[PDB]
Amino acid sequence: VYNDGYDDDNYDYIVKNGEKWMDRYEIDSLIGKGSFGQVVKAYDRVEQEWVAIKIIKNKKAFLNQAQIEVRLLELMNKHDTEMKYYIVHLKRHFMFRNHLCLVFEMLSYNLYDLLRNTNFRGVSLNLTRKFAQQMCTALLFLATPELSIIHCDLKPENILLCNPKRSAIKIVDFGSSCQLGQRIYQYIQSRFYRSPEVLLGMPYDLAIDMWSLGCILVEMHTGEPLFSGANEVDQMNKIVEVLGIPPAHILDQAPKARKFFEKLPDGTWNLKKTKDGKREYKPPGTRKLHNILGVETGGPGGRRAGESGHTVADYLKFKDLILRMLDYDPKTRIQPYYALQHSFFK
Ligand SMILES: O=c1oc2cc(O)ccc2c2oc3cc(O)ccc3c12
């Protein structure tokens, strides 16, 4: 017996379809489970609409992190009001039977489900452009000085379609987010979307979300993760395959530089060599983004020959924006305001 019979043995509320809360919410179904707790679909009888309710684990560490999430969401909707910056809206939060509950607007499926529905052929570059433009606008809103919110977990699963037919999207799940002045975790971002500065144990800021976005946008058009590392060493090596060795002025400040790279006696950094006799990674910078996108060969799978918005010129603009987003240097990596001025969006 936990929490008078309402919790399982892992601090999760035992969800029962049809249960009514506070004469208002009718719990309909489980829609997701995570380390923070659970997310259920529920009908809000008072407002006559569906909602998604995040039920935080009945346990202090998860309660405290979600209390930060609530504060960040409340800060955001104090600066948004009209919900025009593609951020999920917190409708309400409350305690119910020793669980912090976060009520969000109901949304459609996430960008990974969309990819799986294309059987990982990817979506068109035109739809990728629309998603990119809305995400850069969302990041510009996060970069508002009073906010300065780092999401820290941008990935296709955390971007939801508003309606299954429309192209409008929203960023969800600020459960790991922090303001720039209040960073507290070091092992952050899901691995495929993790920035070099996080991999390198360096201090991080809002530029790490732009790195995730660049990775996300390529995957949305190709159907496959750009950097699908199985662990931290593999992830950096897949990054290096495409982008080359990071600038020396970065690695010379990098607490974990020697987890991946070696300094040669003459100051120039190289990769740590793979173990005798196993196939090497492709040499640094030789897995060209140019060929991943299929810039000159009809895009991914050669499927886009003659398609509008997929000319070589369009692919070259997209490639350029991606490389600006995948800059190793978080000071020079393109910023939301300037990504919005990029010719990819013209
Ligand atoms: O915040 C979230 O975190 C999650 C974490 C998971 O592991 C799975 C699903 C969710 C999830 O689905 C939603 C649907 C909405 O309409 C709004 C918010 C969310 C939301």
Side-chain angles (χ1 to χ4, degrees):
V1 58
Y2 312 96
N3 191 33
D4 289 298
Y6 289 110
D7 292 3
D8 63 19
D9 60 23
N10 205 27
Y11 317 99
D12 274 327
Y13 184 84
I14 299 166
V15 162
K16 286 173 167 174
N17 293 359
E19 191 184 34
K20 193 187 197 76
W21 295 4
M22 308 148 64
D23 199 32
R24 174 161 187 184
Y25 306 97
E26 192 171 331
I27 311 302
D28 177 86
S29 40
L30 193 66
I31 57 195
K33 188 168 270 210
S35 53
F36 58 83
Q38 300 165 106
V39 185
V40 297
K41 184 183 179 173
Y43 194 68
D44 181 345
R45 208 68 251 186
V46 162
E47 282 328 298
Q48 299 245 69
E49 81 195 351
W50 293 102
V51 299
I53 309 187
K54 196 188 245 192
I55 312 174
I56 304 299
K57 278 180 167 157
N58 175 15
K59 192 184 207 343
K60 181 158 162 122
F62 298 96
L63 166 67
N64 297 154
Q65 184 61 49
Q67 282 168 333
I68 287 167
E69 180 177 5
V70 166
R71 168 165 57 81
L72 297 184
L73 289 154
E74 290 182 316
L75 201 74
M76 291 191 258
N77 61 33
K78 150 144 67 205
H79 295 75
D80 204 333
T81 280
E82 324 106 311
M83 274 151 317
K84 73 210 163 138
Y85 304 102
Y86 314 96
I87 313 300
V88 75
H89 180 62
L90 179 60
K91 291 181 174 270
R92 181 181 195 195
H93 59 97
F94 57 83
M95 301 294 305
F96 179 76
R97 299 182 176 149
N98 302 312
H99 291 269
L100 184 47
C101 296
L102 284 71
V103 182
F104 301 95
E105 60 186 305
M106 189 74 201
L107 299 158
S108 191
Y109 44 90
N110 67 52
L111 289 198
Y112 188 75
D113 302 323
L114 174 61
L115 248 20
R116 183 214 303 116
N117 297 0
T118 72
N119 225 293
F120 306 100
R121 297 188 235 87
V123 304
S124 82
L125 189 61
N126 298 314
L127 182 58
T128 303
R129 189 179 295 103
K130 288 193 175 90
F131 291 161
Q133 186 177 246
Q134 302 172 69
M135 293 296 297
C136 294
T137 307
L139 292 184
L140 184 56
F141 173 74
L142 297 185
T144 289
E146 301 57 65
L147 302 180
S148 306
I149 290 166
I150 318 174
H151 181 279
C152 304
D153 195 15
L154 283 196
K155 52 180 180 190
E157 288 87 343
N158 283 343
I159 304 160
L160 271 52
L161 294 181
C162 283
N163 290 105
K165 323 148 290 319
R166 288 157 75 265
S167 62
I169 57 175
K170 274 153 183 279
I171 301 181
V172 302
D173 196 359
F174 289 72
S176 298
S177 304
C178 61
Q179 290 180 284
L180 178 55
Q182 316 150 2
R183 301 151 281 160
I184 53 176
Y185 305 117
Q186 290 205 273
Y187 185 63
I188 59 162
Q189 308 190 278
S190 314
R191 191 186 319 110
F192 300 168
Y193 314 100
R194 182 173 304 145
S195 65
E197 58 264 42
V198 171
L199 285 165
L200 282 162
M202 302 192 72
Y204 57 81
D205 58 15
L206 283 68
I208 76 178
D209 285 336
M210 188 62 63
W211 177 277
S212 307
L213 181 55
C215 301
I216 286 159
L217 290 174
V218 176
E219 177 173 355
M220 289 313 298
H221 187 48
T222 68
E224 290 307 329
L226 174 61
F227 305 127
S228 56
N231 55 70
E232 279 214 325
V233 167
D234 190 38
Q235 187 66 32
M236 181 65 80
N237 271 282
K238 289 182 167 185
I239 296 173
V240 165
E241 277 189 329
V242 172
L243 298 173
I245 305 288
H249 75 77
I250 299 292
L251 296 177
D252 293 344
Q253 297 328 301
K256 303 201 201 201
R258 295 170 199 286
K259 185 167 170 193
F260 315 107
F261 306 100
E262 320 185 313
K263 199 161 199 195
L264 291 175
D266 47 284
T268 70
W269 287 88
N270 272 38
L271 273 166
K272 303 172 70 206
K273 302 233 182 336
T274 37
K275 264 197 98 130
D276 278 343
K278 272 340 179 158
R279 182 179 297 182
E280 287 168 342
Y281 288 96
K282 302 176 173 164
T286 70
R287 181 178 182 240
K288 294 300 196 198
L289 191 57
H290 193 93
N291 296 319
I292 290 156
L293 301 176
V295 168
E296 297 178 27
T297 51
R303 287 179 295 255
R304 305 298 180 171
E307 194 151 354
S308 310
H310 304 63
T311 65
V312 186
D314 290 306
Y315 272 113
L316 287 170
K317 290 152 153 141
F318 183 53
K319 185 178 91 174
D320 186 74
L321 180 60
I322 299 299
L323 290 170
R324 295 295 304 117
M325 290 185 179
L326 299 187
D327 190 338
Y328 276 121
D329 189 345
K331 307 298 192 269
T332 61
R333 190 173 302 147
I334 197 167
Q335 263 158 313
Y337 179 84
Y338 291 91
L340 285 164
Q341 314 316 310
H342 196 278
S343 62
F344 181 58
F345 296 122
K346 261 86 172 215

